[PDB]
Design an enzyme around this catalytic site. Structure first.
Site, PDB file in Angstrom:
ATOM      1  N   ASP A  35     -49.463 -24.496  41.377  1.00  0.00           N
ATOM      2  CA  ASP A  35     -50.185 -23.772  40.331  1.00  0.00           C
ATOM      3  C   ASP A  35     -50.290 -22.296  40.712  1.00  0.00           C
ATOM      4  OD1 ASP A  35     -51.834 -22.872  38.312  1.00  0.00           O
ATOM      5  OD2 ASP A  35     -53.583 -24.037  38.937  1.00  0.00           O
ATOM      6  N   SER A 199     -45.005  -8.063  29.454  1.00  0.00           N
ATOM      7  CA  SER A 199     -43.766  -8.263  28.719  1.00  0.00           C
ATOM      8  C   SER A 199     -43.542  -7.111  27.746  1.00  0.00           C
ATOM      9  CB  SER A 199     -43.799  -9.595  27.967  1.00  0.00           C
ATOM     10  OG  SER A 199     -42.674  -9.731  27.119  1.00  0.00           O
TER      11      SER A 199
END
Ligand SMILES: NCc1ccc(C(F)(F)F)cc1
Ligand SMILES: NCc1ccc(C(F)(F)F)cc1
Length: 330
Positions: A35, A199
């Protein structure tokens, strides 16, 4: 040194991925959920409330000759999905695909939430976010990656998740045979303790690419892709019959539909998520309504590039002094 381990989806929907991890002496092998959105290594154990264990493999520190109880240390964690767990702490030897770390904090679960109990295939989590998020009190503990960093050939690990197929987590080296083209690296902010990046935009199917900064985290511990409402609405507008359902808790679509791909930007490079990756099957057994793999982040407060996005790429987590994220097509 280096390490390499295969990671396998737990079910037919790629809801999570488990990776065998050796703990203790002699080795006790548990299947852990790697994780990158959390920083605690915690496991089901002989100390877990017996009614809260349902098929998981448990770590038994009393059977490990290297286990040392960390006196007075406790841990308690709450995940963004409402899951939670807590317990005490041991130090033990932990090995991942040949890569060994001695004196790693192994957090023994005394209490786990119901969703962990109902997941029989996950014996625990291995946190790979930054150590500032570790919940051990009063003395914070380091992640497996942070402890192994100095001995690694290169201070990196890579995630190569498969679509309905096994994949690979590598520590200390970049497999140049595992991806196509070039790796595009982008800046990482550690200010929240996450692998947080920006992004450069998105496109829906064959549509025009929309240049826009989307700040989000690379999270192998989250199943779906969580993006701002404007972007998610633009995607599902291209699926006939798709709608946001309050009772279901997200966007659903007719199972007979074909989903368009989703592209997200990494610098000047593009990562294309095939439409089939966004199909997560019927909302209930026998239903003709299917659940979408791209959902809104409005209720979360942060955008999450989960497995749906990450499994479309070869992802480099560069833990150098100035950390970066690398994305390559594969
Ligand atoms: N995979 C761990 C995780 C879960 C939730 C979040 C949230 F919700 F805070 F973004 C971050 C990290
Ligand atoms: N994001 C961490 C995480 C991973 C798995 C689970 C599950 F599947 F056990 F509920 C909850 C939270």
């Amino acid at each position: 040194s280096t390490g390499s381990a295969t990671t396998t989806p737990i079910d037919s929907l790629d809801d999570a991925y488990i990776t065998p991890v050796q703990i203790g002496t002699p080795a006790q092998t548990l299947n852990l959920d790697f994780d990158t959105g959390s920083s605690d290594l915690w496991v089901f154990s002989s100390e877990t409330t017996a009614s809260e264990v349902d098929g998981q493999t448990i770590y038994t520190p009393s059977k490990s000759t290297t286990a040392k109880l960390l006196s007075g240390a406790t841990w308690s964690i709450s995940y963004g999905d409402g899951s939670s767990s807590s317990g005490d702490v041991y130090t033990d030897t932990v090995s991942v695909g040949g890569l060994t770390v001695t004196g790693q904090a192994v957090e023994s679960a005394k209490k786990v939430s119901s969703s962990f109990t109902e997941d029989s295939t996950i014996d625990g989590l291995l946190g790979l976010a930054f150590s500032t998020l570790n919940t051990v009190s009063p003395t914070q503990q380091k992640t497996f990656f942070d402890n192994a960093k100095a001995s690694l050939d290169s201070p990196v690990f890579t995630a190569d998740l498969g679509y309905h197929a096994p994949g690979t987590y590598n520590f200390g080296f970049i497999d140049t045979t595992a991806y196509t083209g070039s790796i595009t690296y982008t800046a990482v902010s550690t200010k929240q303790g996450f692998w947080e990046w920006t992004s450069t935009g998105y496109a829906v199917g064959s549509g025009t690419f929309k240049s826009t900064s989307i700040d989000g985290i690379a999270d192998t511990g989250t199943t779906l892709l969580y993006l701002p409402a404007t972007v998610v609405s633009a995607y599902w507008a291209q699926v006939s019959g798709a709608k946001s359902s309050s009772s279901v808790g997200g966007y659903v679509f007719p199972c007979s539909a074909t989903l368009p791909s989703f592209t997200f930007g990494v610098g000047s490079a593009r990562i294309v998520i095939p439409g089939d990756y966004i199909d997560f099957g019927p909302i209930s057994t026998g239903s003709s309504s299917c659940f979408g793999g791209i959902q809104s982040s409005a209720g979360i407060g942060i955008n999450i590039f989960g497995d749906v996005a990450l499994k479309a790429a070869f992802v480099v987590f560069n833990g150098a002094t100035t950390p970066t994220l690398g994305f390559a097509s594969k």
